[PDB]
Design a protein around this ligand. Structure first.
Ligand SMILES: Nc1ncnc2c1ncn2[C@@H]1O[C@H](COP(=O)(O)OP(=O)(O)O)[C@@H](O)[C@H]1O
Ligand SMILES: Nc1ncnc2c1ncn2[C@@H]1O[C@H](COP(=O)(O)OP(=O)(O)O)[C@@H](O)[C@H]1O
Ligand SMILES: Nc1ncnc2c1ncn2[C@@H]1O[C@H](COP(=O)(O)OP(=O)(O)O)[C@@H](O)[C@H]1O
Ligand SMILES: [Mg+2]
Ligand SMILES: [Mg+2]
Ligand SMILES: [Mg+2]
Lengths: 302, 293, 292, 298, 298, 293
C-alpha cells in the first residue's frame, strides 16, 4: 500500500496532504478512486489543487490500459484467508479472499461469530497454511467479542496468544452511526499496511435497531449502500478481505448486489453444521461440513 | 460508571444536563451509545446542541479502535455472580456473567425463583466469594418475592440479614408496560454504580396475559423485543448482570427440569463463552446448592 | 386499601370515577395494575385521559424500587389464617397465606368443605391466635355450604354465632358464567377492604358440567382474575378441587382418607415451605389435630 | 317456586316463554342455571333473546353475595322428610332432606320398596311431625309399586287413603330411555310446586338390563347425565330425591347422602348411615310393620 | 485502417500530426468523421491548417457516391464473432458483428461477465469458425475481470492461454471520469488496427455511484457523450463494442443491437434478442460451462 | 432533362462551362432557377458572362402566369414510387411523389430504415407498378444501410438483385459538413437524369451532435433548400427520416409509430393536397408490406 505522504517530492505541500487526511484521503489508491468533483468539496481544497494532485498521483501507480498478464500478476497478491475448515477452504477456492467482499449468513445459533473469531485467529498465520500474516479489524455490532476465546484459539494454533490478541483490533459499534464513523476512520489504520482483514459481526444489527418502521428502510438501504460501498472500496484499496455477518436471506437486492461471495449456514446433527455456498464469481454452489470446537471452526474429523 | 455530571465541566449547561436526565440519559456511556437522531428526539433538545454534547461525551473517554489486549483488561473487571452451586458455577465459569442477559426456563417448582433469591443474596458477597459486593434490584412480575428467604440465605452464608436485606431495591412489575418503564428508569439507580445485578421474574408473565389472541402477537413480539433490547444495553454500560426468568436476544439460556425426589436437573442451551453441559442441583437451606451441600 | 375516591382530589372529574368503577377498577392498586390498552377499552376513556389518570394514581401511591426493608415491613401485614389444626398450620408456616392462591384437593369427602367452613370461621378471629379479624367471601358451586356448621364451630371457638354468620358473604354459583361474573363483581364488595378470605368450593364443578379448549381458556381467565384480586386486596383465595390449575395456585395441599375419621394432609407444593405431611381429623370443633 | 310465566310481565312475549318451556325450562331458577350457550340451542331463540331473558330473570330473583344469615334463612326452607322410624330420623338430623339426593341401598328384602312406600305416604303429612305436606313422584323400574300397600300405611297413619293415592304421581319406566324421558319431562309437573319428593325405585334395575357387556359400561356417561338432571331438579324445585339401588364411583359422588340396609336377627333390620354431608356415621334398628318402617321397640 | 501518419508525405509537418495525436485524431477516417469546428478547438490549430489537413485526408480515401455492389463488398469486411453458443449465433445471424454496439443486459448472476470472458477468448479465434483473430479491449467497472477464467476457457478452446491473455488489454475504471478518460485514450491503442472487440463491463457501474440525487441525472448527457464516443470508435475501427448492463431510454438508442438475459430452471439460462438491426426476436438456451457460454445440449 | 451542353449551340464557348459546373450548375433548369447574383459569386464568371449565360439559356423556356392548359401534361410526368404497401400508397396517392420532399419521422425501431431499403427496390420497377425505372441515391448518416437487405427485397419482388445494387449509389455522410457537400455535388450525378430517388437517413442525426442553435438551423435550412431544389428540377423524390422548421421544407410528412403488439402505424401527418388518413404496415421479407399482405 502507498499512502499520500510520499507525495512530498512530487510537489505537494504539507497543507494539501493534511487537507486530504482530514477529508478521508489516506492513500494514493483513494486519491485515484475519488473523483475531482468529490475532491473539490474537501474542506480547504480549491478547484485547481485537486487536478494537480491527480496528475501528481497518476505518476506513481500506472493507471491505464495493461495486458491481462500483469493483471494476473496483480491478482496474485490477494490472500486466501483460511476459514478454519479445510473443506470450507477448498469449496471457496482457498477461503475468504482479500480485495473482495464475502458474506456469511444464516439463522441464529449457526456458528457465525465463531467463524469471525476463527478468522481473527488464523489471519495472523503466515503464508502456506491459509493465513495472511496481516492484522484484523473487528467491529462488534453485537457486543459479543470474547477476547479470551481468541487467546484460546491462539493456544490451539500454537502461537504466542498475547501477540495474537495485540494484533487483532476491536471496536464496539454502539450504534449504526458509530459503525459508519469507524469504517470511515479505517483510513489511518489500514494505511500502515499491517491490517489485512475487516470482520463485521454483525453488519445489519445496528441498522435494524436504529432504523425501525417501513418509513426509513430506503434510507437505511442507501446508507447501507454507502457503508457497503466504503467497505468494498476499502477492500480494493488496502487489499483486505471484508467478512460480513448477517442474520435471516435478508438485506435485499442491495446486500445481494453488494456481496460478491455469499455463504449460508444451517444446523446439522449435534455440533455438526452444514454450509452452502450460494453465490460466488468463481465457483458453483456446493456443500460443506464443519464443526465448532476448542479451536474454533474446523472439520468434523478434527 | 461515569455519570452525566462530567458533561457540565466539559461545556454543557445545567439545563441541558437536566433535559438529558428527562431524556433517560444518566451516564457518559449512555449518551455515547445514543444515536444523534435518537438523541434529538427528546423534547426540548435541538439538533444543534446534541452534536456538541456528543463530542463533550467523547473527549472524556475514547470510542473506536482499542487493542484487544486493552479490551481484555476491561473484560477482567466483570464479576461472576455465583448461583451458590459450585458445580453450576463451574459449568458457567463462576456463575452468571455481567454485561450480558441470562434467561432461565422450565416447568414450575424448578428453583428459578430460588435461583433469583440466591443471586439476590450472594451479590452482596465480596469478590473471590462469588459476589460483586454490590447492590441488587429485583423486578417482580409474579409476586413471589420473600424477604424472609433473603434473611434466611444471609444466615446461611453468615451475612447480616439486615445488611443484605437493605442492599436490595425492590419493585413489582405489575404489568408489561409498567415493566417497560421500570426497566427504563433504572438509569438513576445504576448511576450510583454500586449495582451488580438486576433480576426480572418472570419476563413473559406480564406480556403473555397483556396481549392475548392471535390478532396482535406479532406486534406484542416487537414490544417484548424492544424491551429485551433495552435490557441488553442496560446490561452493558452499567456492568450489571440481568437475570431473566421464563415460563414454558438472551445471551445465556438455561433449562431446569424436575428430577427424582427433591433434586432437579440443569441444562445449558446458549452461551457465547462455553459449550453446553449438564448438572444437578437441590434447594437446601442456603438456596440452590449441590446435592451433597 | 384505598378507594379511587382519593384520586378525585387530583383534578379528576367524577365521571372518571364512575367509569373506572363500572369497568371493574375500584382501588388505586387496581389502577396501577391495569394497563393503558385495557383501560382505553373502557367506554368513555381516551388515550391521553388514561395516561393522565394513571399518572395521578401513581402520584397517589408510588411504584418503584424501594429498599427491601420497606418490602419486609409491608410484608409483615400479610395475614396467616389458621386452618384449625396446629400441625398443618405449622407445616404451612402459620396457616394459609394471603396475597396467594391456596388450593386443596383430594378424593370425594376428604374434608374440603368442612375445612372450608373452619377457614370461614377462623379468619374472623383476631391476630395473636391465627385469625384475620375480618369477613370472608364464600363461593359455593356444589351446594355444600351449611351456615349451621359455621354456627356450631363458632360456638366451639366461644364467640357470638349470629355475628359470625352475619360476618360471611356467601354466593352460590349456578353455572360457569355465573361463577365468572361473581368473581368479577367481587371487586366492588372488596373495595371496602374488610374481607380476608375468598373460598371457592369447588373451582371446576361447573366447568366440567358446562363443557375443552374454550373451557380451559375460560378457567385460566377465571384463575388469573382470582389471583390478581388476591394480590390486590390483601386476601387469601382458598380453592377446593376434586379428582393446569397448579399454575395459578401458589400453594397446593392434597387430602387423603386415613383410617376411620383420621385424614392426612400432604404439602404437595409450596413457594416457601418444604414438602411436609400432617395428620388431622374432622370433629365437633371442625378441623383439629389427631390427638385433639 | 316461580315459573317462567313470571317473566311475561317483565317484557317477554308468550312466544319466547313457550319456546323456553319446549326446551324443558319451566322455572326462573332453571333459566339462571342454564348457561347462555345451552339456551342458544333452544329452537327459535336468538342470542339477544337469550341475553334479555337472562337479564329479566336476574331481576325477579336476585343472585349475588349475601350475608350468611340470609343463607341460613334460605336453608330454613329445606324440608326434613320422616323416614318412619324415629331413631333413624334422629340419626339423619330430621329424616330425608330436600335440595339433595338421598340414596338407600342393600340386599333384597331389606325393605327399600317398603321404605319408598313409607316416604310416599309420610311426605303428605304436614310439617312439625316429619312430613313435607307435598306431592311425591314415584318412578317404578321394577313393577313393585303397590297402591294397596300405600293405602294400608295411610290407614296406619290415621289419614285418608284415597287422597294419599291421588296425591302421588306414579310412572312406570319400561327401559332406560323411557326412564330418562320421564325424568326430563318431570319439569312440567314439578313446576306446580306441589311435589316435595321424587322416588326412583330403583335407579339401576333398567340400566343393568338395557346395557350389557364391557362396551356399554362406559356409555352407562348417560347415567351421569341422568343423575345430574335429578340433582338439578332437586336443587331447583326444593324436592328430595330418594333413589333406590341394589348391591352385588358414579352414585358415590352423585348422591349427597347414602344408607346401607342390612338384615338383623329374625325380622329385625339395621340401617347404617354410610355417608352424609353433615352427620357422622351411626347405626339404627328398625322393623317393617303394617305402617311401613317403624321403630323396633314399638 | 490507415493512421494519420499517412499525411506526413502529403504536405503536413510532424508538429501538426503530433497535435492531431494529442487531439485524439489518429486515423484518416477519424479526420473525415470529425467537423472542422472540432479541429479548430485543438490548441495550436488554425482554420486554414484544419482545412488543408481535411483536403489532404480526402485524397487518401474517397468519400462519395459509389454503387451498392462496392458497399456490399465493404460490408463483407464485418466480423461475425461467435457468442459461444451456436444457437445464439444463428439467432444473431453470425454472432457479434463489428461496426455496431451490442448491449447485453440482465440481472445479477445472469452471466454477462462470463459471456464477456467467452468473447475475450472467442474473438481471438481465427475466422471461418466464428472468430475475429484480433485483440480485445476490456474495461472493467466492478472488479469482476478474472484472467484465470479466460485462461480456463481458452484451454477449453484449445488455445495457448498465455498469448490469449497477452492479447486482451485490461483497464480497471475506478470512477466515471477515469472510465471516460480511458475510452477517449482508446483511440491511440486502437490505431494499430489489431483489435476487434471492446468490452465494457459494466457500462453504468461507475455512473450509479459517481452521480447521486435527482439533481445529477441531467448531467448523467456526459454518459451520452461517452456512448457516442464508443459508437464512433466501433464505426471507424471495425471493432464490436460489447456493453454490459445491470437491470433492477437513450441508452437503448445508443446500442445498435440488444440481448436480454434471464435465469431459467436450475442452471439453464435464456437469451432473448430483444432488439436487432436486421434480425427478428427469438429465444436461445445457453449455459455457463467450463468453456464459458455454450449450448445446453453440450 | 437537358444539360448545359445543349446550350453550346446558343453561342456559348466551352471555356466557361467547366467553372459554372464547378459552381453547381449542370442543366438549363439550374441556370433558370439560379439568380444573377449567385452566378456572380461563382469565381471566374464575370457579370457580363452571368447575364450572357442566362439570356442565352432563357430562349428555350418561358416565365409568366401559367393557365393549367399544358401543365397537366407536364404534371403527369411525375412518378409514383410505391412504398410497398398498397394501403400506404393509397393514402399517399399511389406512393412517394417526385418533385417534392417526403419526410417520415418516428422513434427508435419504427421501420424508417426498412422503408428506405424497400423504396430503394420499388423504384427499380417500371411504371404501372409503383416504380420509376431508375437509379437511387442513398445518403446514410447512421450507418444502418445494408446491401444484403436490398438483395432480400429485390428477391422478394422477383428482380435481379445484383442489378438492383448496381442501380443504387451509396454515400455515407460522416458529419453535417460532409452531408451538405454530398447534397451540393449530388447535382453532378443527377445530371445524368436517370435517378428517381434520394434517401437521407437520417436528416437530423449529424446536426444533433455537431451543434449554438442559431447557426444549426441556419445551416439546416440551407441544406433543406438545396434538397428541395434538387427534387424540384431533377424530377426525383427526396426521402428523409427523423428520430423523435423541418415541417415547412418537407411537402409530405408521415409519422411511424409502434402500436399494440407487432402492429405499426403509418399516419399521414401532413400532405400538400391529400387529407390525413390511417394505415397499418408490417416489415416482412419483401420489405414494407400490408398487414394482410
Ligand atoms: N470457549 C468455547 N469453547 C468451545 N466452544 C465454544 C466456546 N464458546 C462458544 N462455543 C460454541 O460456539 C457455538 C457457536 O457460537 P457463535 O458463533 O457465537 O454462534 P452465532 O452463530 O449465534 O454467533 C456455540 O454453540 C458454543 O457452544
Ligand atoms: N469461474 C467460473 N467458472 C464457471 N462458471 C462460472 C464462473 N464464475 C461464474 N460462473 C457462472 O456464471 C454465473 C454468474 O455469471 P456472471 O457473468 O458473473 O453474471 P453477471 O455478469 O450477469 O452478474 C454463476 O452463477 C455461475 O453459474
Ligand atoms: N429482414 C427483416 N425482415 C423482417 N423484419 C425486419 C428485418 N430486418 C429488420 N426488421 C424489423 O424492422 C425493425 C427495425 O426498424 P428500423 O428500420 O431499424 O427503423 P429505424 O431505422 O426507425 O430504427 C426491427 O424491429 C425488426 O423487427
Ligand atoms: Mg453471533
Ligand atoms: Mg457482472
Ligand atoms: Mg434507422
Amino acid at each position: 500500500i502507498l499512502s499520500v505522504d510520499e507525495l512530498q517530492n512530487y510537489g505537494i505541500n504539507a497543507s494539501d496532504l493534511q487537507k486530504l487526511k482530514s477529508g478521508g484521503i489516506y492513500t494514493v489508491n483513494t486519491v485515484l478512486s475519488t473523483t475531482r468533483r468529490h475532491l473539490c468539496k474537501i474542506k480547504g481544497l480549491s478547484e485547481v489543487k485537486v487536478e494537480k494532485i491527480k496528475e501528481a498521483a497518476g505518476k506513481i501507480i500506472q493507471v491505464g490500459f495493461i495486458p491481462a498478464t500483469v493483471q494476473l500478476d496483480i491478482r496474485q497478491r490477494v490472500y486466501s484467508l483460511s476459514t478454519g475448515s479445510k473443506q470450507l477452504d477448498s469449496i471457496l477456492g482457498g477461503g475468504i479472499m482479500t480485495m473482495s467482499i464475502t458474506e456469511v449468513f444464516g439463522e441464529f445459533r449457526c456458528g457465525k461469530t465463531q467463524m469471525s473469531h476463527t478468522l481473527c485467529v488464523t489471519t495472523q498465520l503466515p503464508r502456506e497454511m491459509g493465513g495472511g500474516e496481516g492484522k484484523v479489524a473487528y467491529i462488534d455490532t453485537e457486543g459479543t467479542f470474547r477476547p479470551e476465546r481468541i487467546k484460546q484459539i491462539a493456544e490451539g494454533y500454537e502461537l504466542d496468544p498475547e501477540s495474537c490478541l495485540a494484533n487483532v483490533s476491536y471496536a464496539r459499534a454502539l450504534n449504526s452511526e458509530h459503525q459508519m464513523e469507524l469504517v470511515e476512520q479505517l483510513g489511518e489504520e489500514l494505511s500502515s499496511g499491517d491490517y489485512r482483514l475487516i470482520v463485521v459481526d454483525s453488519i445489519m444489527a445496528n441498522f435494524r435497531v436504529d432504523y425501525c418502521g417501513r418509513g426509513e428502510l430506503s434510507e437505511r438501504q442507501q446508507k447501507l449502500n454507502q457503508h457497503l460501498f466504503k467497505l468494498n472500496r476499502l477492500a480494493e484499496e488496502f487489499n483486505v478481505a471484508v467478512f460480513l455477518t448477517n442474520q435471516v436471506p435478508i438485506g435485499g437486492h442491495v446486500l445481494a448486489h453488494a456481496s460478491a461471495t455469499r455463504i449460508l449456514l444451517r444446523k446439522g446433527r449435534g455440533d455438526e453444521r452444514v454450509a452452502k455456498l450460494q453465490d460466488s464469481p468463481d465457483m458453483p454452489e456446493k456443500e460443506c461440513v464443519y464443526v465448532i470446537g476448542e479451536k474454533g471452526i474446523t472439520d468434523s474429523s478434527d
